[PDB]
Symmetry: D2
Subunit: 126 residues, 4 copies
């Protein structure tokens, strides 16, 4: 897909990462809201905050990875590393409420899946 | 899905609107980039600008519509009206390059589909 | 600033609206976080949700209003109306906690100021 | 500002980084639009693309850095590294058009300033 500098990149891995980022951003926005409406909250504040970060970073990553013109591997690697890191953190935080709140079980799966997609694409941008 | 103030809302129409916004934001980000890489551009500048607006508004609309806690129909109606309006404008602009650039044919379909989803949900929030 | 279609627009009002949107988005992001950390919360859930919507819409509005190329008054009016409406809603919600939480007093002022800037610019785009 | 895990962080450096991210996001959005309207473009396509990435990452970074609740230094470091990297890339790209287009001179200064603010805050999160 387009420039020589993106020669040898897995276009399927790029497509999977973009779809995973958009699904994971929406999952995290939905999960921050679901935790907000739980008669519990108070105990879910780090979870809500991490959901908000994870939605913001997945949104930005989906946009950066969607652009081929004037591709810069340094920018793309740094953005993928940020998204991998926040997805890992948000997956772990949501998994802690997997039994207390069904929304966090589903969101934990979304974060873990997007973490894997970012890591797989990052590993191939050498 | 959650509060009494969202009694009588079509949850399926709400879900379709959220998925359409995320697919249309990514379609418009991809199309701004595709037009940027076209040996043409120069003639595609309004198209690129409208793609950027349409991605920004679809992103915001997907997030607002994903939230049920403390739902406010005035805010939701105003955001859906904005998204309907920009999707209409971006659909028309991309359709003009439908024969010159395949990306704009696909993006025009995305904008028209998301315009319909916003209008259908807006009509039922009375 | 640029096209004939933006002839007769107040460039100072446009600049004030953009700066107000960015200051108000950050104020609302900060206030959602401040309410999240308040030993209270539980009672601040509509406030947090409205802060999140208001940040998302102010962010999108700042970007749309920053663009002059292929200006479309219908899109700009609809986006300003959405931002005015959410700033009004978020200003009212934060003002309710003005005495309980200092963050919401400061955020209420930010929302009211950005509401005024959107309304003033909207009134002149006839 | 709030949790023990943010003990020893420079609150002034945190505030400067947030303001720099919001000013730099708007500078880059404005510069992508300014390059789009330049009778040149064609030659400014990498510049426009990098402006779009830099606006998206600065927007996300401003939001993440605005949140104190459940602070995670790994997430914050990774996001600051991404923002530093894209600001460096966008500063260099805009500087190349500093003499051809006044918008890119002003945007290059914005990118360089925000790069410095991210690097200074990152260095102190050890
Ligand atoms: Cu991704
Ligand atoms: Cu993601
Ligand atoms: Cu997510
Ligand atoms: Cu949640
Ligand atoms: Cu949660
Ligand atoms: Cu959560
Ligand atoms: Cu998450
Ligand atoms: Cu994420
Ligand atoms: Cu991502
Ligand atoms: Cu991620
Ligand atoms: Cu999570
Ligand atoms: Cu959770
Ligand atoms: Cu949860
Ligand atoms: Cu969760
Ligand atoms: Cu998640
Ligand atoms: Cu989550
Ligand atoms: Cu994720
Ligand atoms: Cu996540
Ligand atoms: Cu990912
Ligand atoms: Cu990814
Ligand atoms: Cu939608
Ligand atoms: Cu849409
Ligand atoms: Cu779209
Ligand atoms: Cu396009
Ligand atoms: Cu186009
Ligand atoms: Cu376009
Ligand atoms: Cu579009
Ligand atoms: Cu859109
Ligand atoms: Cu939408
Ligand atoms: Cu739309
Ligand atoms: Cu379009
Ligand atoms: Cu087009
Ligand atoms: Cu096109
Ligand atoms: Cu298009
Ligand atoms: Cu489109
Ligand atoms: Cu389009
Ligand atoms: Cu659309
Ligand atoms: Cu669109
Ligand atoms: Cu829509
Ligand atoms: Cu919609
Ligand atoms: Cu504004
Ligand atoms: Cu605003
Ligand atoms: Cu605000
Ligand atoms: Cu607050
Ligand atoms: Cu609040
Ligand atoms: Cu609030
Ligand atoms: Cu607010
Ligand atoms: Cu706002
Ligand atoms: Cu605004
Ligand atoms: Cu507003
Ligand atoms: Cu508010
Ligand atoms: Cu409040
Ligand atoms: Cu508050
Ligand atoms: Cu508030
Ligand atoms: Cu506010
Ligand atoms: Cu507020
Ligand atoms: Cu506001
Ligand atoms: Cu507000
Ligand atoms: Cu405003
Ligand atoms: Cu405004
Ligand atoms: Cu910053
Ligand atoms: Cu920045
Ligand atoms: Cu910038
Ligand atoms: Cu520029
Ligand atoms: Cu440029
Ligand atoms: Cu540029
Ligand atoms: Cu830039
Ligand atoms: Cu930036
Ligand atoms: Cu930044
Ligand atoms: Cu940056
Ligand atoms: Cu730049
Ligand atoms: Cu440039
Ligand atoms: Cu320029
Ligand atoms: Cu520039
Ligand atoms: Cu810049
Ligand atoms: Cu720039
Ligand atoms: Cu920057
Ligand atoms: Cu920049
Ligand atoms: Cu920075
Ligand atoms: Cu920074």
């Amino acid at each position: 897909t387009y420039p020589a500098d993106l020669g040898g990149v897995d276009r399927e891995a790029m497509a999977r990462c973009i779809e995973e980022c958009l699904r994971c951003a929406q999952a995290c926005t939905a999960c921050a809201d679901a935790c907000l409406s739980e008669p519990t909250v108070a105990d879910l504040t780090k979870c809500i905050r991490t959901d908000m970060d994870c939605a913001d970073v997945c949104t930005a990553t989906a946009a950066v990875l969607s652009r081929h013109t004037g591709y810069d591997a340094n920018v793309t690697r740094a953005v993928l590393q940020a998204c991998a890191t926040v997805c890992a953190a948000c997956g772990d935080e949501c998994a802690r409420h997997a039994g207390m709140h069904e929304a966090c079980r589903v969101c934990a799966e979304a974060c873990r899946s997007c973490e894997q997609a970012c890591q797989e694409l990052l590993a191939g941008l050498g």
